[PDB]
Structure 1
Amino acid sequence: MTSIHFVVHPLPGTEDQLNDRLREVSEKLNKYNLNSHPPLNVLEQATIKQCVVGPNHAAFLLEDGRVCRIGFSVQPDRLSPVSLGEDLQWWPDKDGTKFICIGALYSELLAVSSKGELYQWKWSESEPYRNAQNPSLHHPRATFLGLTNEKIVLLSANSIRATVATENNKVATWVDETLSSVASKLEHTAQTYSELQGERIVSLHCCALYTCAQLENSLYWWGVVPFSQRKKMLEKARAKNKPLYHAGAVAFSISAGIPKVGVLMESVWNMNDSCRFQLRSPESLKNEEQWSLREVVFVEDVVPDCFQRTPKKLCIPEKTEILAVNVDSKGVHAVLKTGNWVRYCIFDLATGKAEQENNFPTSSIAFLGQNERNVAIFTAGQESPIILRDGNGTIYPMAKDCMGGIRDPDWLDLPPISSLGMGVHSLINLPANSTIKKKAAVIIMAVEKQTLMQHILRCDYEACRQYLMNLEQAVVLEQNLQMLQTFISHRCDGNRNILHACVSVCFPTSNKVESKDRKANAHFILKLLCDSVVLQPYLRELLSAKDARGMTPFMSAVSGRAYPAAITILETAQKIAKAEISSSEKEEDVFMGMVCPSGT
């Protein structure tokens, strides 16, 4: 059980704006507590496994192998802001094909079945693709790709590019149908590479230009080289000789979130200066706009070769494991760990080495969390900012200080996020003379429904008391030990348990639902959690747990100027430590563990 939320972020902007939007959705979830949307209600009841945001639609892949699609639009003057369609259309399932991964394209969603089969939809079609000449034929390009005789296991896609890996370590990459002009130089059919051989492909990620593959201990990149290396190579070629490009040049670009293929009328003489292109409509294949040369690419008739076809490895340190990788315009971003010390690295394709390396201000143990497999990175690829997901499943804020480092994160109080999706979407039907930003990024959120912790963050005494009363009745019934364990291990952003949530919501706001009423209710909730019989065996575990800053609930109360809360936690700790029966354990040892644990 989860809840679905929508946010939209103007693409040209700073990470602080993304953090502000996340704060806004968190406040809407907590401060306001509005009603849910009926159209997505059914989708909420099942466990989402993946999400992809198309240009105008959205697609969700569930655990039960039943995909759905829903459209969306954005109101421009209000910049939930996203307006959704009246109804959602599902995927017709016959003979229980089921699905494993899904992807997004300008040809809309893309699907992979259990046995391995490349299904897809499109904006122009309201029905899954079928072939009259062959009932078993779908995605005719797959016949070109050769994946019709393979079991597809890994799939990734973005605005234009799509990459597939099967059981036989065969990588098949292609572009959208709009890029068929350059498809000769940007596609490779199913094939196995010696570099990829010897290991199983753990993951693979795509982008508007290139594609990365994460192996057991290595990372590989293949595809179009970025503009900086292009210009370095062009300058080297020019110096070797001692009109960069002639007129009538066919090229394509993915600027403004739309892959457009045009022809260059004027020979390029200034590399930074934007130049005009004449659009080539697909109907004419079967309109003059000045595009910047910063993000374009041209198909070459035959100067050293620009496109890099053979994947190359990017250096990672010794005896280091990779937890999550994703790829954007700036390069490939990853999170790495060796021993117990975790870093966030940005790899430029220029050097192939650690272009940027940053240490998290919080503890590495808190970042690793209960499960190390939930770490993930989200980036659309072109302009969207990075969204991080730590071990506990919550979202780790990412802001840069006045130096080369990560700012001390400010917590969103957002519960763990089951599925995060993001999509480039360029606003249309708007005046061109307006100075407002054109494109944006649509972010869809699947937040877990943690009952008690959301109640605590709401400063809702009544719901918390009812929850605890029904919980004690269930404990008397001896049928909800699982529920007790579940609500004990529940965590919020920063490795914060329910006690940390009570302390954090007990903090003073300003010098002398009302804020004073909110603080009072927080105090009542803290007292209830401390004195209630049910969490007696677990309170020592909760009071001894550490925040992301290595801070127990008492430590947080002292640090956050929640002094009455600190006194309450101190007396509760004394009571629990005295009441606990000594089994080769001391009084001062446990009391210090729950007040100021060793190693701080």
Structure 2
Amino acid sequence: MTSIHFVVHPLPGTEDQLNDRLREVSEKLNKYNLNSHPPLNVLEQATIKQCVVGPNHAAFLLEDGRVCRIGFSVQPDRLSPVSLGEDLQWWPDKDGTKFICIGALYSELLAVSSKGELYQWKWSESEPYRNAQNPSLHHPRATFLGLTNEKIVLLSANSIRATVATENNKVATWVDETLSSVASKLEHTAQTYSELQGERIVSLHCCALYTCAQLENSLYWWGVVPFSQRRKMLELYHAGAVAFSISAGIPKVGVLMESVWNMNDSCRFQLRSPEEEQWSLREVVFVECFQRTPKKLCIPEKTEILAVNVDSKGVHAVLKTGNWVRYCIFDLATGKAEQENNFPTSSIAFLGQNERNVAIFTAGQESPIILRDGNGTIYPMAKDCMGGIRDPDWLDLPPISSLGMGVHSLINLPANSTIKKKAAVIIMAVEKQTLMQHILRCDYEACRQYLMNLEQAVVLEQNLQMLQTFISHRCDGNRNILHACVSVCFPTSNKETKEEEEAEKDRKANAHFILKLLCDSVVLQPYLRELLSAKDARGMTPFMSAVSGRAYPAAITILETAQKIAKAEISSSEKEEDVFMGMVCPSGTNPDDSPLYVLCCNDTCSFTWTGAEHINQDIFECRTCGLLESLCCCTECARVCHKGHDCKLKRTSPTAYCDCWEKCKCKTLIAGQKSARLDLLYRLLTATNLVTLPNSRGEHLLLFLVQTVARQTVEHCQYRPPMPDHDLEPPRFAQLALERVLQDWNALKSMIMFGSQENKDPLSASSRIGHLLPEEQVYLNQQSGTIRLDCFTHCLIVKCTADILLLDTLLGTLVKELQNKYTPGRREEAIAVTMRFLRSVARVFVILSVEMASIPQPIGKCKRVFQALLPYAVEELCNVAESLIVPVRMGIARPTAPFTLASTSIDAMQGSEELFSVEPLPPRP
């Protein structure tokens, strides 16, 4: 059962207004109850195969061959939105013949039946045309087209022209009866093109001027030569020509009497009766330079083709190469790929369950493009400041069984109004998924009654076909019921976070109760593993979506549910850790999409604690979003925002105040619950192994946290206490995160033993050495890396001169693991970790002491570290001095220039910053 909806989109418009109309339909489905029409209720209980839109009428083709039509009127436009006709009447079918295809022209409605008969119905006439002389003949031009001796299959209809095709590779075309005067030389009857032989034509799509035929592995076009190729023809039109235009929703034929020299202007055409207007030459095609032969489009070899639709801009195609999907726009001037675009989401989620649901919908020249993916949902397309596809914002819509749109022209416009003349009318037959809509409407009672009814039905009749059909239910962006519940559970306001800072509807609660009800459901137990281990269009599980969307109690509930389910299904291989990591953070995942890393880098945006001020920050630039000249963004914007974009850091940074909300939707303006965030960090530290995996910049979590702390200490001291809200405190989470992570013998071990043999850094040249000579592999495997460890030690000691607690935390963890005579192998492991850390501390201390003249705070911190670990620091300092004194005694010292010492401490820090804050050599691409 499906429901019918009407969308009015005035022309000319952008994709943003169309997306706003689709969104308005989406919340009218979601939060505005339900509404329909009396005469369309009979259409709701059947599978509508095809919907077409005429000038003032709409036609529906069903599965059983019944065709119905209705009238409508659209008043408002732009500087229910439609009025429907009172009664619906059907096609007279006393002969009992079912119908296969329908199509809409301006003056007639076309039908193709199973017996190969073409039927024509006038819009003005209330009864379909039947010839009295020939009872077996029904189309008035069937004799002229010569289709009476061949069974007919494929139809394509548009505003003025129609193109039709048999089984015998015979294609014909004609124009509407309102242009019968110029219909002597623009058309052709059924030929047999030898160039199209070899493969059956699988689809035909007609534009307003030309038409296209898609075969099994080729594309051909024929018809009117486009306006871009008229430059070479005039590389200048004499008077006396006869032309036609389709402007303002009406087709008209005129005659020229001026001489034309420049073709970029507008010309005045004398009107011709069907038995004197100023028209632009871009919408005028001279008839009395026509591509009467099919021309092959250039496509790459071994590429499957999915959906073809044509318009004035060219040929729009979806191409599949291997396991990848491109979107292509072909220009008819050269026949090559004019525009090539890659989808910003995953291709696997775009392919969906079935590849036959991918389609492209358009209505004419200026009409927009609606793309339908493999799941039957709408993929919203928009253009960024560059020439790519913007990141899509999901509409939360059910899949569409049938979609059809057309161009309508408004009637009797006043002369003193700026209302646009033309619009597009879109008709949707959206499916209903009742528990999906119950989840999206935030109602606990309907979900509870549905689960109780399903449990009673399984207990009584033992039927699970409806349940296994409901498991495969999807929303937009490849989202299941759990994904929809998580997306509903996102925080919206900052009221609780605003009120907790002092002296220091019911949608959310119903959503949480719904999540608990589906988590503790008895009947949903054998499918919750497949529900939780599913990836959406961004490649995230519901736990990853709850972490990234700042829904922390939802992530806590999902984590307990995964821990409960995973312990009862070990049995065979693919064991407990494999099931748990499949549910939490699966393999083949980007390192910047880890739940621990994302949980660490979700901080409050800097406009929330700085208004229109001009404090000193770090300034990032996006090429994609348009933050180019004076528009800027804070560092948390570069972390959470702009993750797949072309975002860079500018060295010449003046003062700015995060102009990120002006150009895009900043995802960091709202802070979630702090206690649930710390509890999630506590649970993720002691249950997974996500802390030993670096991010896409090759940084450990400890290095990222200490760099965030060292940046925020400098940035947050210029906060003055009293369009988005700017009355919140600066974020304090990274200090507590460092204090918790440093109390762990996995993170400290992986940080200190970084760059060793059993630790791979993706941005190091020594990581990928398997294709080299064996001697070079020996020379590269002799050494070990200590760049990032030295950077971490320098950032902990020199750049963190506002706290001491992290150093005592690290020293306490080291001493506690050194005094552990309980588990085997712990003591020597802690000894080696202590040796590596003391080597790094000794190197930093030596550099700082050489740079200073004849105590500073970092030297005091190094002395405290040496005093807390005396019997090993003495030996490592002996080794450091021995290494320093070797080249003097052997007389092989490298000559250097003299330098002056440092009287103050800021210049020594400036000189040691350039020595330790470096990067290893990247591998060869």
**TM-score, normalised on structure 1?**
0.94
Does structure 1 conserve the Cα–Cα contact (< 8 Å) formed by 2:23 and 2:395? yes
**Measured at CA, do residues 101 and 389 of structure 1 come closer, stay the same or move farther in structure 2, by a change above 3 Å?**
same
Does structure 1 conserve the Cα–Cα contact (< 8 Å) formed by 2:8 and 2:77? no
- Which piece of structure 1 moves more, 458-467 or 274-283? 274-283
- Aligned partners of 1:330 and 1:375: how far apart in 2? 20
Partner of 1:69: helix, strand, or coil?
Answer: strand
Equivalent of 1:570, from 518, 541, 559?
559
- Aligned partners of 1:570 and 1:498: how far apart in 2? 17
Does structure 1 conserve the Cα–Cα contact (< 8 Å) formed by 2:248 and 2:421? yes
Does structure 1 conserve the Cα–Cα contact (< 8 Å) formed by 2:103 and 2:157? yes
Partner of 1:516: helix, strand, or coil?
Answer: coil
- Aligned partners of 2:345 and 2:21: how far apart in 1? 23
Cα offset, 1:249, TM superposition? 2.2
- Aligned partners of 2:503 and 2:327: how far apart in 1? 40
- Aligned partners of 2:359 and 2:102: how far apart in 1? 17
Structure 2 gap segments, 5+ residues each: 495-500, 588-925
Does structure 2 conserve the Cα–Cα contact (< 8 Å) formed by 1:159 and 1:257? no
Cα offset, 1:141, TM superposition? 1.1
- Aligned partners of 1:521 and 1:79: how far apart in 2? 40
Q: Output one character per residue of 1:45-70: Cα deviation in whole Å (capped at 9) or x when no partner.
A: 10011110001000011111101000
**Measured at CA, do residues 520 and 232 of structure 1 come closer, stay the same or move farther in structure 2, by a change above 3 Å?**
farther
Q: Output one character per residue of 1:111-163: Cα deviation in whole Å (capped at 9) or x when no partner.
A: 11011111121222110111111111111212111112211111111001111
Q: Output one character per residue of 1:546-567: Cα deviation in whole Å (capped at 9) or x when no partner.
A: 0001011111111111111111
- Aligned partners of 1:517 and 1:2: how far apart in 2? 29
Does structure 2 conserve the Cα–Cα contact (< 8 Å) formed by 1:395 and 1:493? yes
- Which piece of structure 1 moves more, 195-204 or 363-372? 195-204
Partner of 1:484: helix, strand, or coil?
Answer: helix
**Measured at CA, do residues 77 and 364 of structure 1 come closer, stay the same or move farther in structure 2, by a change above 3 Å?**
closer
Does structure 2 conserve the Cα–Cα contact (< 8 Å) formed by 1:424 and 1:440? yes
Does structure 2 conserve the Cα–Cα contact (< 8 Å) formed by 1:57 and 1:108? no
Does structure 2 conserve the Cα–Cα contact (< 8 Å) formed by 1:7 and 1:80? no
Cα offset, 1:165, TM superposition? 1.1
Bigger proportion of residues as helix = 2
**Measured at CA, do residues 514 and 568 of structure 1 come closer, stay the same or move farther in structure 2, by a change above 3 Å?**
farther
Partner of 2:518: helix, strand, or coil?
Answer: helix
Bigger proportion of residues as strand = 1
| Rg larger for | 2
Cα offset, 1:42, TM superposition? 0.4
- Aligned CA RMSD, in angstroms, stands at 2.4
Q: Output one character per residue of 1:329-385: Cα deviation in whole Å (capped at 9) or x when no partner.
A: 100101110111101111111111110010001100000000000000001121110
**Measured at CA, do residues 79 and 417 of structure 1 come closer, stay the same or move farther in structure 2, by a change above 3 Å?**
farther
- Aligned partners of 1:45 and 1:403: how far apart in 2? 45
- Aligned partners of 2:408 and 2:9: how far apart in 1? 10
Cα offset, 1:77, TM superposition? 6.3
- Which piece of structure 1 moves more, 74-83 or 576-585? 74-83
- Which piece of structure 1 moves more, 498-507 or 86-95? 86-95
Cα offset, 1:583, TM superposition? 2.5
Does structure 2 conserve the Cα–Cα contact (< 8 Å) formed by 1:250 and 1:299? yes
Cα offset, 1:530, TM superposition? 1.2
**Measured at CA, do residues 338 and 510 of structure 1 come closer, stay the same or move farther in structure 2, by a change above 3 Å?**
same
Cα offset, 1:479, TM superposition? 4.8
Does structure 2 conserve the Cα–Cα contact (< 8 Å) formed by 1:55 and 1:108? no
Cα offset, 1:515, TM superposition? 27
Cα offset, 1:228, TM superposition? 0.7
Q: Output one character per residue of 1:4-50: Cα deviation in whole Å (capped at 9) or x when no partner.
A: 00010012011111111101111111110232211111011100111
- Which piece of structure 1 moves more, 390-399 or 188-197? 188-197
**Measured at CA, do residues 219 and 19 of structure 1 come closer, stay the same or move farther in structure 2, by a change above 3 Å?**
same
- Aligned partners of 1:353 and 1:294: how far apart in 2? 23
Cα offset, 1:184, TM superposition? 2.5
- Aligned partners of 1:183 and 1:453: how far apart in 2? 53
Cα offset, 1:272, TM superposition? 1.4
Cα offset, 1:295, TM superposition? 1.2
**Measured at CA, do residues 77 and 379 of structure 1 come closer, stay the same or move farther in structure 2, by a change above 3 Å?**
closer
Does structure 1 conserve the Cα–Cα contact (< 8 Å) formed by 2:222 and 2:291? yes
**Measured at CA, do residues 514 and 63 of structure 1 come closer, stay the same or move farther in structure 2, by a change above 3 Å?**
farther
Q: Output one character per residue of 1:555-599: Cα deviation in whole Å (capped at 9) or x when no partner.
A: 11111111111111111111111122422220111111111111x
**Measured at CA, do residues 529 and 431 of structure 1 come closer, stay the same or move farther in structure 2, by a change above 3 Å?**
same
Q: Output one character per residue of 1:226-274: Cα deviation in whole Å (capped at 9) or x when no partner.
A: 1111223222xxxxxxxx2233321111122221111223222331111
- Which piece of structure 1 moves more, 168-177 or 259-268? 259-268
- Aligned partners of 1:84 and 1:375: how far apart in 2? 30
Cα offset, 1:110, TM superposition? 1.2
Cα offset, 1:514, TM superposition? 28
User: What residue number does 1:528 align with?
Assistant: 517
**Measured at CA, do residues 593 and 77 of structure 1 come closer, stay the same or move farther in structure 2, by a change above 3 Å?**
closer
Does structure 2 conserve the Cα–Cα contact (< 8 Å) formed by 1:346 and 1:355? yes
Alignment: residue pair count:
581
**Measured at CA, do residues 359 and 289 of structure 1 come closer, stay the same or move farther in structure 2, by a change above 3 Å?**
same
Cα offset, 1:327, TM superposition? 0.5
- Aligned partners of 2:506 and 2:463: how far apart in 1? 33
Structure 1 gap segments, 5+ residues each: 236-243, 301-305
- Which piece of structure 1 moves more, 57-66 or 75-84? 75-84
Pairs within 5 Å for 1:515-554: 516-554=505-543
- Aligned partners of 2:313 and 2:476: how far apart in 1? 27
Does structure 2 conserve the Cα–Cα contact (< 8 Å) formed by 1:415 and 1:447? yes
- Which piece of structure 1 moves more, 438-447 or 174-183? 174-183
- Which piece of structure 1 moves more, 71-80 or 159-168? 71-80
**TM-score, normalised on structure 2?**
0.62
Cα offset, 1:185, TM superposition? 2.5
- Which piece of structure 1 moves more, 259-268 or 342-351? 259-268
**Measured at CA, do residues 552 and 438 of structure 1 come closer, stay the same or move farther in structure 2, by a change above 3 Å?**
same
Cα offset, 1:415, TM superposition? 0.6
Does 1:590 pair with 2:579? yes
**Measured at CA, do residues 199 and 429 of structure 1 come closer, stay the same or move farther in structure 2, by a change above 3 Å?**
same
Which has the higher relative contact order, 1 or 2, with Cα contacts under 8 A spaced 6 or more apart? 1
Runs of 4+ in 1 over 4 A off after TM superposition: 512-516
- Aligned partners of 2:463 and 2:420: how far apart in 1? 52
Cα offset, 1:198, TM superposition? 1.0
- Aligned partners of 2:557 and 2:172: how far apart in 1? 61
Q: Output one character per residue of 1:180-203: Cα deviation in whole Å (capped at 9) or x when no partner.
A: 233233211112211221111111
Does structure 2 conserve the Cα–Cα contact (< 8 Å) formed by 1:49 and 1:62? yes
Equivalent of 1:507, from 480, 490, 501?
490
**Measured at CA, do residues 479 and 334 of structure 1 come closer, stay the same or move farther in structure 2, by a change above 3 Å?**
farther
Q: Output one character per residue of 1:72-131: Cα deviation in whole Å (capped at 9) or x when no partner.
A: 110126871011100111111123211111111001321110111111212221101111
- Which piece of structure 1 moves more, 5-14 or 179-188? 179-188
Pairs within 5 Å for 1:175-324: 175-235=175-235, 244-283=236-275, 288-300=276-288, 306-324=289-307
User: What residue number does 1:80 align with?
Assistant: 80
Does structure 2 conserve the Cα–Cα contact (< 8 Å) formed by 1:394 and 1:417? yes
**Measured at CA, do residues 513 and 12 of structure 1 come closer, stay the same or move farther in structure 2, by a change above 3 Å?**
farther
Q: Output one character per residue of 1:187-225: Cα deviation in whole Å (capped at 9) or x when no partner.
A: 111122112211111111111001111111111111101
Does structure 1 conserve the Cα–Cα contact (< 8 Å) formed by 2:172 and 2:188? yes
**Measured at CA, do residues 73 and 479 of structure 1 come closer, stay the same or move farther in structure 2, by a change above 3 Å?**
farther
- Aligned partners of 1:339 and 1:111: how far apart in 2? 38
Does structure 2 conserve the Cα–Cα contact (< 8 Å) formed by 1:552 and 1:595? yes
- Aligned partners of 1:167 and 1:432: how far apart in 2? 51
**Measured at CA, do residues 157 and 515 of structure 1 come closer, stay the same or move farther in structure 2, by a change above 3 Å?**
farther
Cα offset, 1:390, TM superposition? 0.1
- Which piece of structure 1 moves more, 87-96 or 435-444? 87-96
Does structure 1 conserve the Cα–Cα contact (< 8 Å) formed by 2:78 and 2:420? no
**Measured at CA, do residues 179 and 475 of structure 1 come closer, stay the same or move farther in structure 2, by a change above 3 Å?**
same
**Measured at CA, do residues 427 and 515 of structure 1 come closer, stay the same or move farther in structure 2, by a change above 3 Å?**
farther
Q: Output one character per residue of 1:375-430: Cα deviation in whole Å (capped at 9) or x when no partner.
A: 00001121110000000000000101111110000001011000110001111111
- Aligned partners of 1:366 and 1:165: how far apart in 2? 35
Cα offset, 1:469, TM superposition? 1.4
Does structure 2 conserve the Cα–Cα contact (< 8 Å) formed by 1:342 and 1:359? yes
User: What residue number does 2:321 align with?
Assistant: 338
Does structure 1 conserve the Cα–Cα contact (< 8 Å) formed by 2:155 and 2:163? yes
**Measured at CA, do residues 480 and 110 of structure 1 come closer, stay the same or move farther in structure 2, by a change above 3 Å?**
farther
